[PDB]
Backbone as JSON, one array per atom type, in Angstrom:
{
  "sequence": "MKTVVFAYHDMGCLGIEALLAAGYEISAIFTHTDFYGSVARLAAERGIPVYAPDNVNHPLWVERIAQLSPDVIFSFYYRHLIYDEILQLAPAGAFNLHGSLLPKYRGRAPLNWVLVNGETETGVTLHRMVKRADAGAIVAQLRIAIAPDDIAITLHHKLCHAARQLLEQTLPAIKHGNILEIAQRENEATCFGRRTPDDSFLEWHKPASVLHNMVRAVADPWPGAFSYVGNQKFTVWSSRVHPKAQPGSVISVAPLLIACGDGALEIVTGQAGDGITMQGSQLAQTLGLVQ",
  "N": [[73.35, 109.56, 88.62], [72.63, 110.06, 92.04], [73.7, 112.1, 94.75], [74.87, 112.85, 98.11], [76.73, 115.27, 99.5], [79.61, 115.94, 101.49], [81.46, 118.56, 102.35], [84.21, 120.95, 102.34], [86.31, 123.88, 102.26], [88.96, 124.52, 99.74], [89.33, 122.04, 98.48], [86.83, 120.95, 98.89], [85.27, 122.62, 97.32], [86.31, 122.16, 94.72], [85.73, 119.49, 94.49], [82.96, 119.38, 94.5], [82.48, 120.84, 92.15], [83.63, 119.04, 90.34], [81.96, 116.82, 90.6], [79.64, 117.84, 89.59], [80.4, 118.4, 87.0], [80.75, 115.84, 86.11], [78.23, 114.92, 85.83], [76.75, 114.19, 88.11], [73.96, 114.27, 90.37], [73.58, 116.47, 92.78], [72.07, 116.37, 95.74], [72.17, 117.54, 98.23], [74.42, 119.45, 100.24], [76.73, 119.18, 102.83], [78.38, 121.1, 105.13], [80.71, 123.33, 106.82], [80.59, 126.04, 109.19], [82.55, 128.96, 109.16], [91.35, 131.93, 103.34], [90.59, 130.31, 101.35], [88.13, 128.92, 98.98], [84.56, 129.13, 99.42], [82.46, 126.55, 100.27], [79.81, 126.75, 100.94], [78.97, 129.17, 99.73], [79.36, 128.4, 97.05], [77.51, 126.34, 96.86], [75.15, 127.74, 97.44], [75.11, 129.45, 95.3], [74.88, 127.63, 93.17], [72.39, 126.69, 93.66], [71.97, 124.56, 95.38], [70.81, 122.74, 98.12], [72.13, 123.46, 101.32], [73.72, 122.55, 104.32], [74.97, 123.18, 107.59], [75.39, 121.74, 110.09], [76.83, 121.35, 113.34], [77.37, 118.76, 114.09], [76.65, 115.69, 112.66], [76.01, 113.18, 113.5], [73.57, 111.92, 114.47], [70.22, 110.86, 114.87], [68.42, 112.75, 113.66], [69.71, 113.86, 111.5], [70.38, 111.54, 110.14], [67.97, 110.7, 109.24], [67.16, 112.82, 107.62], [69.09, 112.73, 105.65], [68.57, 110.16, 104.69], [66.12, 110.52, 103.51], [66.81, 111.91, 101.27], [67.78, 110.02, 99.66], [70.47, 109.17, 98.66], [72.59, 107.74, 96.11], [75.16, 107.47, 96.32], [77.79, 108.64, 98.47], [79.88, 111.42, 99.05], [82.89, 112.63, 100.51], [84.61, 115.53, 100.8], [87.09, 116.85, 102.17], [85.63, 117.38, 104.48], [85.42, 118.01, 107.89], [84.62, 116.55, 110.16], [83.58, 113.55, 111.89], [81.61, 111.21, 110.11], [79.26, 109.23, 110.82], [78.76, 105.6, 110.48], [76.01, 104.97, 110.32], [75.03, 106.88, 108.73], [76.68, 106.8, 106.39], [76.13, 104.22, 105.42], [73.75, 104.51, 104.12], [73.98, 104.93, 101.46], [73.8, 102.98, 98.7], [75.85, 102.58, 96.73], [78.04, 103.15, 98.12], [80.44, 105.13, 100.04], [82.76, 107.72, 99.49], [85.91, 109.18, 100.12], [88.07, 111.99, 99.81], [91.32, 112.32, 100.29], [94.12, 114.15, 101.37], [96.81, 112.77, 101.04], [99.35, 110.27, 100.48], [97.9, 107.7, 101.08], [98.34, 104.52, 102.66], [99.9, 106.27, 104.29], [100.1, 109.12, 106.42], [97.37, 109.32, 107.43], [94.53, 110.8, 108.9], [94.57, 114.08, 110.41], [95.44, 117.29, 108.89], [97.34, 116.52, 106.66], [98.67, 117.97, 104.71], [100.25, 119.84, 106.1], [101.77, 118.17, 107.86], [103.3, 116.53, 106.09], [105.16, 118.36, 105.25], [106.36, 119.18, 107.59], [107.68, 116.83, 108.26], [109.53, 116.71, 106.23], [108.99, 115.39, 103.77], [109.45, 114.28, 100.37], [107.53, 113.97, 98.65], [103.97, 113.7, 98.07], [100.43, 113.36, 97.92], [97.15, 112.8, 96.43], [94.34, 110.99, 97.46], [91.6, 108.96, 96.61], [89.28, 107.24, 98.31], [87.38, 104.38, 99.52], [85.0, 104.77, 102.11], [85.18, 103.27, 105.13], [84.4, 101.47, 108.19], [86.62, 102.11, 109.85], [88.29, 105.13, 110.07], [89.77, 106.81, 107.29], [90.93, 104.52, 106.24], [89.84, 102.9, 104.29], [89.57, 101.04, 101.14], [91.52, 101.93, 98.24], [90.51, 103.9, 95.49], [91.77, 105.4, 93.58], [95.01, 106.87, 93.38], [97.07, 109.68, 93.31], [100.21, 110.88, 92.88], [102.3, 113.65, 93.89], [105.17, 115.69, 93.57], [107.13, 117.13, 96.18], [108.62, 120.13, 96.36], [111.81, 121.51, 97.36], [111.46, 124.21, 97.95], [108.77, 124.47, 98.36], [105.97, 125.56, 100.27], [103.43, 125.45, 102.78], [101.15, 126.73, 101.51], [101.83, 126.7, 98.68], [102.06, 124.04, 98.22], [99.54, 123.24, 98.84], [98.05, 124.29, 96.7], [99.11, 122.71, 94.66], [98.22, 120.19, 95.47], [95.46, 120.54, 95.25], [95.26, 120.88, 92.52], [96.04, 118.32, 91.68], [94.01, 116.83, 92.82], [91.86, 117.74, 91.29], [92.56, 116.7, 88.81], [92.55, 113.97, 89.38], [89.86, 113.46, 90.23], [88.43, 114.2, 87.93], [88.66, 112.02, 86.19], [88.13, 109.8, 87.8], [85.58, 110.15, 88.96], [83.7, 109.82, 86.85], [84.24, 107.19, 86.4], [83.4, 105.92, 88.74], [80.72, 106.37, 88.48], [80.03, 104.53, 86.61], [80.1, 102.19, 88.07], [81.19, 99.72, 90.6], [84.65, 99.83, 91.33], [87.68, 98.04, 91.14], [89.18, 98.16, 94.05], [92.17, 99.22, 95.79], [93.57, 97.72, 98.49], [94.53, 99.06, 101.68], [97.48, 98.69, 103.43], [97.61, 97.99, 106.65], [99.93, 97.75, 108.26], [101.55, 99.54, 107.14], [100.53, 101.97, 107.56], [100.24, 105.35, 108.85], [99.31, 107.76, 111.21], [98.08, 110.96, 111.99], [97.28, 113.51, 114.38], [95.19, 116.4, 115.07], [96.89, 119.46, 114.75], [98.42, 121.24, 117.37], [99.08, 124.4, 119.02], [101.55, 124.02, 120.11], [102.77, 122.24, 118.39], [104.02, 123.74, 116.44], [106.08, 124.91, 117.55], [109.36, 126.0, 117.59], [112.29, 124.28, 118.33], [115.4, 124.86, 119.2], [117.5, 122.97, 119.53], [117.27, 121.09, 117.68], [117.99, 119.87, 114.28], [118.89, 122.32, 111.83], [117.68, 121.96, 109.34], [115.3, 120.52, 109.96], [113.95, 122.39, 111.45], [113.62, 124.33, 109.57], [111.93, 122.99, 107.85], [109.68, 122.95, 109.48], [109.05, 125.66, 109.54], [108.34, 126.02, 106.85], [106.11, 124.34, 106.75], [104.02, 125.59, 108.17], [103.83, 128.18, 107.19], [102.68, 131.46, 106.24], [99.49, 131.47, 104.65], [99.12, 130.0, 107.08], [99.45, 129.73, 110.69], [102.25, 130.08, 111.38], [105.63, 129.22, 112.37], [107.01, 129.22, 115.61], [108.96, 130.74, 118.33], [110.72, 131.77, 121.33], [112.19, 134.73, 122.73], [113.52, 134.75, 125.36], [111.01, 135.78, 127.22], [109.47, 136.7, 125.18], [107.38, 136.11, 122.51], [107.97, 135.11, 119.12], [107.55, 134.94, 115.59], [108.56, 132.93, 112.9], [108.47, 133.54, 109.7], [109.65, 132.98, 107.25], [112.48, 131.19, 106.14], [115.98, 130.07, 105.88], [118.36, 127.55, 105.38], [121.56, 127.08, 106.8], [124.95, 125.93, 106.66], [128.92, 125.48, 116.06], [128.31, 126.73, 118.39], [126.14, 127.5, 121.25], [122.94, 125.99, 121.02], [120.27, 127.92, 119.72], [121.42, 130.3, 120.19], [122.44, 133.56, 119.03], [124.02, 133.85, 115.98], [124.5, 135.76, 114.05], [123.13, 138.98, 113.31], [122.39, 140.24, 111.03], [122.59, 138.92, 108.09], [119.9, 137.54, 110.14], [120.86, 134.91, 111.96], [120.4, 131.86, 113.59], [121.88, 129.61, 115.79], [121.62, 126.1, 115.52], [120.91, 122.68, 116.53], [122.32, 121.44, 114.69], [123.88, 122.91, 112.04], [122.67, 126.14, 110.89], [119.9, 128.38, 111.28], [118.54, 130.74, 109.22], [116.6, 133.52, 109.82], [114.58, 134.76, 107.7], [112.27, 136.34, 107.36], [109.93, 137.54, 109.77], [107.99, 138.03, 112.79], [107.45, 139.94, 115.77], [105.75, 138.82, 118.45], [102.44, 139.91, 118.11], [103.04, 141.74, 116.28], [104.0, 143.47, 113.21], [105.08, 141.8, 110.17], [108.48, 141.6, 109.3], [111.8, 142.03, 107.88], [114.37, 139.69, 108.75], [116.68, 140.95, 109.87], [115.66, 143.34, 110.85], [113.84, 142.33, 112.62], [115.53, 141.23, 114.44], [116.63, 143.47, 115.69], [114.29, 144.48, 116.77], [113.67, 142.55, 118.64], [115.77, 142.85, 120.34], [118.09, 141.46, 119.96], [121.59, 140.48, 119.68], [124.79, 139.72, 118.27]],
  "CA": [[73.66, 109.15, 90.02], [72.41, 111.14, 92.98], [74.64, 112.06, 95.85], [74.85, 113.8, 99.19], [78.14, 115.61, 99.63], [80.13, 116.57, 102.7], [82.59, 119.28, 101.75], [84.68, 122.2, 102.89], [87.61, 124.37, 101.77], [89.17, 124.44, 98.29], [89.08, 120.66, 98.04], [85.39, 120.75, 98.86], [84.74, 123.33, 96.16], [86.65, 121.5, 93.47], [85.08, 118.2, 94.44], [81.58, 119.66, 94.09], [82.52, 121.19, 90.73], [83.91, 117.83, 89.56], [80.79, 115.97, 90.58], [78.68, 118.48, 88.71], [80.87, 118.23, 85.63], [80.61, 114.42, 85.79], [76.81, 114.59, 85.71], [76.08, 113.74, 89.33], [72.9, 115.12, 90.86], [73.89, 116.74, 94.18], [70.83, 116.67, 96.44], [72.46, 118.4, 99.36], [75.83, 119.57, 100.63], [76.93, 119.39, 104.25], [79.63, 121.81, 105.25], [80.97, 123.89, 108.13], [80.61, 127.5, 109.19], [83.96, 129.26, 109.33], [91.79, 132.33, 102.0], [89.99, 129.35, 100.43], [86.78, 129.05, 98.46], [83.48, 128.75, 100.32], [81.57, 125.54, 99.74], [78.43, 127.25, 101.11], [78.69, 130.12, 98.66], [79.25, 127.67, 95.8], [76.24, 125.63, 96.89], [74.1, 128.77, 97.38], [75.12, 129.93, 93.93], [74.41, 126.58, 92.27], [71.02, 126.33, 94.04], [71.99, 123.25, 96.03], [70.58, 122.9, 99.56], [73.35, 123.32, 102.07], [73.55, 122.51, 105.77], [76.2, 123.23, 108.34], [75.25, 121.36, 111.49], [78.11, 121.09, 113.99], [77.53, 117.32, 114.29], [75.59, 115.0, 111.94], [75.87, 111.83, 114.03], [72.36, 111.95, 115.26], [69.12, 110.43, 114.01], [67.76, 113.83, 112.92], [70.39, 113.97, 110.22], [70.35, 110.3, 109.42], [66.69, 110.65, 108.57], [67.14, 113.84, 106.57], [69.89, 112.21, 104.55], [67.89, 109.0, 104.14], [65.04, 111.01, 102.67], [67.4, 112.39, 100.02], [68.07, 108.79, 98.92], [71.67, 109.2, 97.81], [73.08, 106.47, 95.61], [76.56, 107.49, 96.72], [78.11, 109.79, 99.31], [81.27, 111.86, 98.91], [83.43, 113.53, 101.54], [85.75, 116.26, 100.25], [87.64, 117.7, 103.21], [84.7, 117.62, 105.57], [86.3, 117.84, 109.04], [84.06, 115.79, 111.26], [83.18, 112.17, 111.75], [80.3, 111.0, 109.51], [79.19, 107.84, 111.19], [78.28, 104.6, 109.55], [74.57, 104.93, 110.13], [74.79, 107.77, 107.59], [77.37, 106.31, 105.2], [75.52, 103.01, 104.9], [72.53, 104.84, 103.4], [74.31, 104.94, 100.03], [74.14, 101.65, 98.21], [77.1, 102.53, 95.98], [79.13, 103.42, 99.03], [80.87, 106.5, 100.36], [84.15, 107.91, 99.12], [86.57, 110.32, 100.72], [89.23, 112.51, 99.12], [92.28, 112.62, 101.34], [95.34, 114.73, 100.87], [98.1, 112.16, 101.27], [99.58, 108.96, 99.86], [97.42, 106.71, 102.03], [98.09, 104.64, 104.1], [100.71, 107.22, 105.06], [99.43, 110.36, 106.76], [95.94, 109.31, 107.66], [94.27, 111.78, 109.93], [94.52, 115.51, 110.21], [96.47, 118.14, 108.3], [98.46, 115.89, 105.96], [99.39, 119.0, 103.98], [101.3, 120.38, 106.96], [102.66, 117.14, 108.39], [104.31, 116.06, 105.15], [106.22, 119.37, 105.17], [107.05, 119.09, 108.88], [108.56, 115.67, 108.19], [110.44, 116.83, 105.11], [108.74, 114.43, 102.7], [109.78, 114.8, 99.06], [106.38, 113.66, 97.8], [102.73, 113.46, 98.78], [99.5, 113.1, 96.82], [95.74, 112.8, 96.8], [93.8, 109.65, 97.38], [90.16, 108.86, 96.73], [89.12, 105.9, 98.87], [86.08, 104.01, 100.08], [84.91, 105.06, 103.53], [84.75, 102.09, 105.86], [84.24, 101.77, 109.61], [87.83, 102.76, 110.29], [88.58, 106.37, 109.35], [90.88, 106.94, 106.34], [91.55, 103.23, 105.99], [89.16, 102.18, 103.22], [90.31, 100.72, 99.91], [91.81, 103.03, 97.33], [89.93, 103.9, 94.13], [92.9, 105.9, 92.81], [95.93, 107.72, 94.13], [97.9, 110.46, 92.41], [101.35, 111.45, 93.58], [102.91, 114.89, 93.44], [106.45, 115.89, 94.22], [107.2, 118.29, 97.05], [109.88, 120.8, 96.02], [112.45, 122.08, 98.54], [110.95, 125.54, 98.25], [107.33, 124.5, 98.57], [105.56, 125.83, 101.63], [102.07, 124.94, 102.86], [100.24, 127.24, 100.49], [102.13, 126.3, 97.31], [101.78, 122.6, 98.16], [98.09, 123.15, 98.85], [97.56, 124.48, 95.33], [99.47, 121.53, 93.88], [97.33, 119.1, 95.87], [94.15, 120.81, 94.66], [95.35, 120.6, 91.1], [96.08, 116.86, 91.55], [92.66, 116.38, 93.14], [91.01, 118.02, 90.12], [92.94, 115.74, 87.78], [92.11, 112.65, 89.81], [88.42, 113.38, 90.21], [87.92, 114.33, 86.57], [88.55, 110.7, 85.58], [87.58, 108.77, 88.66], [84.17, 110.32, 89.23], [82.89, 109.14, 85.84], [84.49, 105.75, 86.56], [82.53, 105.46, 89.82], [79.37, 106.44, 87.98], [79.84, 103.28, 85.88], [79.99, 101.06, 88.97], [82.27, 99.45, 91.53], [85.98, 99.76, 90.76], [88.46, 97.14, 91.99], [89.96, 99.05, 94.88], [93.45, 98.77, 96.31], [93.58, 97.68, 99.95], [95.59, 99.75, 102.35], [98.14, 97.73, 104.31], [97.67, 98.58, 107.98], [101.29, 97.78, 108.79], [102.27, 100.64, 106.52], [99.83, 103.2, 107.87], [100.69, 106.31, 109.87], [98.18, 108.61, 111.52], [98.4, 112.2, 112.69], [96.16, 114.2, 114.97], [95.09, 117.83, 114.81], [98.06, 120.17, 115.25], [98.22, 122.16, 118.47], [100.07, 125.47, 118.86], [102.83, 123.45, 120.5], [103.35, 121.54, 117.25], [104.75, 124.63, 115.55], [107.11, 125.5, 118.4], [110.72, 125.72, 117.14], [113.2, 123.9, 119.43], [116.69, 125.04, 118.57], [118.48, 121.88, 119.64], [117.05, 120.24, 116.51], [118.75, 120.24, 113.09], [118.33, 123.48, 111.14], [116.78, 121.47, 108.27], [114.03, 120.13, 110.54], [113.26, 123.61, 111.84], [113.29, 124.97, 108.31], [110.71, 122.32, 107.38], [108.57, 123.38, 110.3], [108.7, 127.0, 109.05], [107.65, 125.81, 105.58], [104.86, 123.63, 107.02], [102.96, 126.47, 108.65], [104.05, 129.51, 106.68], [101.48, 132.22, 105.92], [98.47, 131.85, 105.63], [99.02, 129.22, 108.29], [99.92, 130.46, 111.87], [103.68, 130.32, 111.5], [106.44, 128.49, 113.34], [107.4, 130.24, 116.59], [109.9, 130.48, 119.43], [110.73, 132.89, 122.25], [113.45, 135.38, 123.05], [113.2, 134.9, 126.76], [109.57, 135.7, 127.38], [108.83, 137.33, 124.02], [107.15, 135.18, 121.41], [108.19, 135.65, 117.79], [107.2, 133.97, 114.57], [109.49, 132.88, 111.79], [107.62, 133.36, 108.53], [110.4, 132.37, 106.18], [113.82, 130.85, 106.6], [116.97, 129.5, 104.98], [119.27, 126.71, 106.15], [122.97, 127.36, 106.58], [125.86, 124.9, 107.18], [130.03, 125.78, 116.95], [127.77, 127.61, 119.44], [124.98, 126.96, 121.95], [121.76, 126.08, 120.16], [119.38, 129.0, 120.08], [122.2, 131.53, 120.32], [122.55, 134.34, 117.81], [125.28, 133.81, 115.27], [124.6, 137.07, 113.41], [121.85, 139.68, 113.32], [122.11, 140.73, 109.68], [121.27, 138.32, 108.31], [119.63, 136.94, 111.45], [121.11, 133.47, 111.96], [120.31, 131.23, 114.89], [122.55, 128.32, 115.83], [120.73, 124.99, 115.81], [121.61, 121.49, 116.98], [123.17, 121.15, 113.55], [123.66, 123.92, 111.03], [122.07, 127.35, 111.44], [118.68, 128.76, 110.58], [118.43, 132.17, 108.99], [115.22, 133.98, 109.89], [114.49, 135.72, 106.6], [111.21, 137.27, 107.73], [109.24, 137.06, 110.95], [107.39, 139.13, 113.51], [107.56, 139.8, 117.21], [104.4, 138.8, 118.99], [101.4, 140.19, 117.13], [103.54, 142.87, 115.51], [104.02, 143.21, 111.78], [106.15, 141.06, 109.56], [109.64, 142.38, 108.9], [112.96, 141.24, 107.52], [115.05, 139.15, 109.92], [117.59, 141.93, 110.48], [114.87, 144.28, 111.61], [113.25, 141.56, 113.7], [116.6, 141.06, 115.43], [116.69, 144.7, 116.47], [113.03, 144.57, 117.5], [113.76, 141.6, 119.75], [116.91, 143.17, 121.19], [119.15, 140.48, 119.71], [122.92, 140.92, 119.28], [125.61, 138.54, 118.01]],
  "C": [[73.44, 110.29, 91.01], [73.31, 110.98, 94.19], [74.41, 113.14, 96.89], [76.34, 114.01, 99.44], [78.48, 116.33, 100.91], [81.39, 117.24, 102.19], [82.93, 120.58, 102.43], [86.0, 122.58, 102.24], [87.76, 124.26, 100.25], [88.9, 123.05, 97.74], [87.59, 120.4, 97.95], [84.81, 121.41, 97.62], [85.06, 122.59, 94.88], [86.0, 120.13, 93.35], [83.64, 118.36, 93.98], [81.56, 119.98, 92.58], [82.75, 119.94, 89.88], [82.72, 116.9, 89.51], [79.79, 116.52, 89.59], [79.1, 118.29, 87.27], [80.72, 116.78, 85.17], [79.14, 113.97, 85.7], [76.1, 114.1, 86.96], [75.03, 114.76, 89.74], [73.18, 115.28, 92.36], [72.62, 117.22, 94.87], [71.01, 117.62, 97.59], [73.95, 118.37, 99.63], [75.87, 119.89, 102.11], [78.29, 120.03, 104.36], [79.8, 122.37, 106.66], [80.9, 125.4, 108.06], [82.1, 127.75, 109.41], [84.33, 129.72, 110.74], [91.16, 131.43, 100.92], [88.55, 129.62, 100.02], [85.76, 128.55, 99.47], [82.57, 127.73, 99.66], [80.13, 126.07, 99.85], [78.07, 128.23, 100.0], [78.52, 129.4, 97.32], [77.91, 126.94, 95.74], [75.11, 126.64, 96.69], [73.97, 129.29, 95.96], [74.59, 128.91, 92.94], [72.98, 126.11, 92.62], [70.92, 124.94, 94.66], [71.78, 123.46, 97.52], [71.88, 122.65, 100.29], [73.1, 123.44, 103.57], [74.89, 122.51, 106.45], [76.05, 122.87, 109.81], [76.64, 121.07, 112.06], [78.42, 119.58, 114.08], [76.37, 116.6, 113.59], [75.28, 113.6, 112.47], [74.75, 111.72, 115.02], [71.23, 111.54, 114.33], [68.4, 111.51, 113.19], [68.39, 113.93, 111.54], [70.39, 112.68, 109.45], [69.06, 110.28, 108.61], [66.6, 111.64, 107.42], [67.94, 113.34, 105.39], [69.22, 111.0, 103.89], [66.81, 109.44, 103.17], [65.54, 111.51, 101.32], [67.79, 111.23, 99.11], [69.33, 108.83, 98.06], [72.06, 107.81, 97.33], [74.5, 106.33, 96.15], [76.82, 108.73, 97.57], [79.57, 110.13, 99.09], [81.65, 112.77, 100.05], [84.65, 114.21, 100.92], [86.19, 117.28, 101.3], [86.67, 118.17, 104.28], [85.57, 117.26, 106.79], [85.85, 117.01, 110.21], [83.71, 114.39, 110.87], [81.8, 112.09, 111.11], [80.12, 109.54, 109.84], [78.52, 106.89, 110.24], [76.8, 104.56, 109.32], [74.21, 105.85, 108.96], [75.41, 107.17, 106.31], [76.73, 105.07, 104.59], [74.24, 103.27, 104.1], [72.73, 104.77, 101.9], [74.68, 103.57, 99.52], [75.45, 101.53, 97.46], [78.3, 102.84, 96.86], [79.41, 104.89, 99.25], [82.34, 106.59, 100.05], [84.66, 109.21, 99.66], [87.82, 110.69, 99.93], [90.18, 112.97, 100.2], [93.59, 113.1, 100.76], [96.67, 114.09, 101.21], [98.16, 110.86, 100.5], [99.2, 107.9, 100.9], [98.07, 105.37, 101.67], [98.94, 105.59, 104.91], [99.87, 108.48, 105.29], [97.93, 110.37, 106.84], [95.77, 110.39, 108.7], [94.26, 113.21, 109.46], [95.72, 116.2, 109.59], [97.63, 117.47, 107.57], [99.29, 116.89, 105.15], [100.55, 119.51, 104.84], [102.27, 119.33, 107.45], [103.66, 116.63, 107.37], [105.45, 117.07, 105.04], [107.04, 119.33, 106.45], [108.08, 117.97, 108.83], [109.53, 115.65, 107.02], [110.24, 115.8, 104.01], [109.07, 115.09, 101.36], [108.61, 114.53, 98.11], [105.15, 113.53, 98.67], [101.71, 113.21, 97.67], [98.08, 113.18, 97.29], [95.22, 111.41, 96.58], [92.3, 109.68, 97.5], [89.98, 107.42, 97.2], [87.74, 105.66, 99.41], [86.12, 104.29, 101.58], [84.37, 103.83, 104.25], [84.62, 102.46, 107.33], [85.42, 102.58, 110.15], [88.19, 103.98, 109.43], [89.87, 106.34, 108.54], [91.58, 105.65, 105.97], [90.93, 102.41, 104.87], [89.99, 102.01, 101.96], [90.4, 101.89, 98.94], [91.23, 102.88, 95.93], [91.05, 104.36, 93.18], [93.73, 106.8, 93.69], [96.86, 108.38, 93.13], [98.96, 111.18, 93.21], [101.84, 112.77, 93.01], [104.23, 115.02, 94.19], [106.35, 117.12, 95.1], [108.58, 118.87, 96.75], [110.47, 121.41, 97.29], [111.91, 123.45, 98.93], [109.44, 125.61, 98.4], [107.06, 124.85, 100.02], [104.1, 125.35, 101.65], [101.15, 125.43, 101.76], [100.56, 126.8, 99.06], [101.83, 124.81, 97.16], [100.27, 122.39, 98.12], [97.54, 123.31, 97.44], [97.93, 123.29, 94.46], [98.56, 120.36, 94.19], [95.95, 119.3, 95.24], [94.17, 120.52, 93.19], [95.32, 119.07, 90.86], [94.69, 116.3, 91.81], [91.74, 116.59, 91.95], [91.29, 116.98, 89.03], [92.42, 114.36, 88.12], [90.6, 112.49, 89.71], [87.83, 113.42, 88.81], [87.76, 112.96, 85.9], [87.94, 109.65, 86.49], [86.1, 108.92, 88.94], [83.33, 109.65, 88.13], [83.05, 107.63, 85.98], [83.58, 105.18, 87.65], [81.09, 105.42, 89.34], [79.03, 105.16, 87.21], [79.73, 102.05, 86.79], [81.15, 100.88, 89.93], [83.58, 99.28, 90.76], [86.75, 98.83, 91.68], [89.4, 98.06, 92.75], [91.2, 98.39, 95.42], [93.43, 98.86, 97.83], [94.76, 98.43, 100.53], [96.17, 98.69, 103.28], [98.32, 98.45, 105.63], [99.07, 98.73, 108.54], [102.09, 98.92, 108.18], [101.62, 101.99, 106.81], [100.48, 104.05, 108.94], [99.5, 107.24, 110.01], [98.63, 109.8, 112.32], [97.15, 112.88, 113.22], [96.19, 115.67, 114.6], [96.3, 118.49, 115.46], [97.66, 121.22, 116.27], [99.24, 123.28, 118.3], [101.47, 124.97, 119.18], [103.54, 122.75, 119.35], [104.11, 122.43, 116.27], [105.82, 125.39, 116.33], [108.5, 125.05, 117.94], [111.62, 125.43, 118.35], [114.58, 123.9, 118.79], [117.72, 123.94, 118.66], [118.35, 120.94, 118.45], [117.87, 120.71, 115.31], [118.09, 121.44, 112.41], [117.35, 123.04, 110.04], [115.38, 121.11, 108.78], [113.25, 121.39, 110.92], [112.79, 124.35, 110.61], [112.01, 124.32, 107.77], [109.49, 122.73, 108.19], [108.11, 124.76, 109.82], [107.89, 126.89, 107.75], [106.23, 125.25, 105.79], [103.71, 124.51, 107.46], [103.14, 127.94, 108.29], [102.69, 130.13, 106.35], [100.83, 131.6, 104.68], [98.27, 131.01, 106.87], [99.63, 130.11, 109.41], [101.38, 130.78, 112.08], [104.36, 129.52, 112.59], [106.91, 129.56, 114.33], [108.38, 129.77, 117.64], [109.81, 131.69, 120.36], [112.12, 133.43, 122.45], [113.11, 135.66, 124.49], [111.71, 134.71, 126.88], [108.77, 136.32, 126.23], [108.63, 136.34, 122.88], [107.46, 135.87, 120.09], [107.89, 134.54, 116.81], [108.2, 134.08, 113.45], [108.62, 132.56, 110.58], [108.35, 132.72, 107.36], [111.83, 132.22, 106.66], [114.72, 130.27, 105.51], [117.94, 128.72, 105.86], [120.71, 127.04, 105.79], [123.8, 126.27, 107.25], [126.38, 125.16, 108.59], [129.6, 126.74, 118.07], [126.54, 126.98, 120.1], [123.76, 127.04, 121.04], [120.86, 127.2, 120.66], [120.09, 130.33, 120.2], [122.32, 132.23, 118.98], [123.93, 134.34, 117.21], [125.55, 135.16, 114.61], [123.2, 137.66, 113.41], [121.46, 140.24, 111.98], [123.05, 140.03, 108.69], [121.14, 137.7, 109.69], [119.79, 135.43, 111.37], [121.12, 132.95, 113.38], [121.0, 129.87, 114.83], [121.55, 127.23, 116.21], [121.57, 123.81, 116.28], [122.62, 121.09, 115.93], [122.86, 122.18, 112.48], [123.07, 125.16, 111.69], [120.82, 127.67, 110.65], [118.66, 130.26, 110.45], [116.94, 132.51, 109.04], [115.17, 135.08, 108.84], [113.43, 136.77, 106.9], [110.53, 136.68, 108.95], [108.6, 138.25, 111.63], [107.53, 138.87, 114.99], [106.16, 139.87, 117.75], [103.37, 138.98, 117.89], [101.76, 141.41, 116.29], [103.55, 142.53, 114.03], [105.24, 142.43, 111.32], [107.24, 142.01, 109.09], [110.78, 141.46, 108.52], [113.66, 140.81, 108.82], [115.95, 140.15, 110.63], [116.82, 142.92, 111.32], [114.27, 143.58, 112.82], [114.27, 141.4, 114.83], [116.66, 142.3, 116.31], [115.45, 144.85, 117.33], [113.04, 143.71, 118.74], [114.95, 141.86, 120.67], [118.05, 142.18, 121.07], [120.48, 141.1, 119.28], [123.73, 139.65, 119.06], [126.23, 138.03, 119.31]]
}
């Protein structure tokens, strides 16, 4: 079975490796220019043509892809719209690997949003690509638990591991033909957009648990959850939730505890502005905080 692949990031790399292990002939890989593996380097190393146009929804690319005559198309964490004029070129269809328990968390950054929302589980889904983005029928879905101490990076590795497990068996299954797919129920779908810097802004009137989840959701290597001490921005890299004061006020400086709408949030590590990461107690002194 020959295929044209759209891929990026660790998921893109493992998807390409899985296709290769399943005997697929990858005619070309479409990716993006830039801690994760490089799909371009993997393609370059495997001798697979690789392209990184900013936008493929143009006849120039439709024709180039048509000439490659893919039987099937795969999208593994490609970040841009691949329009139907391209996807319809593959008689066996197009399939996308999405990092959530679809229909929940369609859209962008499901890895981060499930942590923001304090979900206790998430998963990977391989689904048919239809007109409507992330809504096509499910070939297979594999759930993973989210542990209280998982942060974006540890959950990312778990998702990649699940993706490897899922693809290892589903790719050969697709090679044998159409699989009876599971329809997504629109009434159960949720969709998220790309996260803006504002989406990681800590608002102290919220419950400490919610803020703690935000810290976990964008912990290093992600940008970090942030707030301000007056006009000084600071980032909270790691935190701890604790069980009678104005929200946002300092309860203690060592450890650094901030009163929230409910409970308190201990800033275990963080940084002031673009300064270096330090323990919360030191950050408190750096920011001029006092009980």
